[PDB]
Amino acid sequence: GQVQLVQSGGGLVQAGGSLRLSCAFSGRTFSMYTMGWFRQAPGKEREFVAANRGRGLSPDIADSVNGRFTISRDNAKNTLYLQMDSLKPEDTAVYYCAADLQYGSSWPQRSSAEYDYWGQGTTVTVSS
């Protein structure tokens, strides 16, 4: 399965504003992958943000962003999204999407080490 994840979106945003991140999947059967968002802030551990399953209806969303960040996938475009609302300075980070084949994966899966494929990352900088 030739798999690649290509991210789009991000950049500068004002505190209180909104951004939507994109993660385009190339390869066979998007729906057999658990897809996750992680972020890396300076001096902090890599943080799980949100994840969903190939055909799942109930995503897993970290407490630190619950009520502000939402996730979905568009199967026609084979693309995963992260909608980030009510952005705060502490949301500044490099954001990555990751994919894991659902044969043998855990659910939920908040450990980055268990994801096999990774996007190139996009930097989100929240200004005040």
Residue numbers in the entry: 1 to 128
Question: What's in the article?
Answer:
The protein was successfully crystallized in two different forms: in space group C2 with a single copy of BCD090-M2 in the asymmetric unit and in P1 with two molecules and two cadmium ions in the unit cell. The crystal structures of the VHH antibody in space groups C2 and P1 were solved by molecular replacement at 1.6 and 1.9 Å resolution. The high resolution of the dataset and good quality of the electron density maps allowed us to build a precise atomic model of the antibody. The CDR H1 and H2 belonged to two large common clusters, H1-13-1 and H2-10-2 respectively. The CDR H3 was not assigned to any known structure cluster, probably due to size (18 residues) and complex structure of the loop, which has a cis-proline and four aromatic residues. Surprisingly, the CDR H2 existed in multiple distant conformations in different crystal forms, while the more complex CDR H3 had a low structural variability. We crystallized the antibody in two different forms and solved high-resolution structures, giving an insight to the organization of the putative ErbB3 binding paratope.
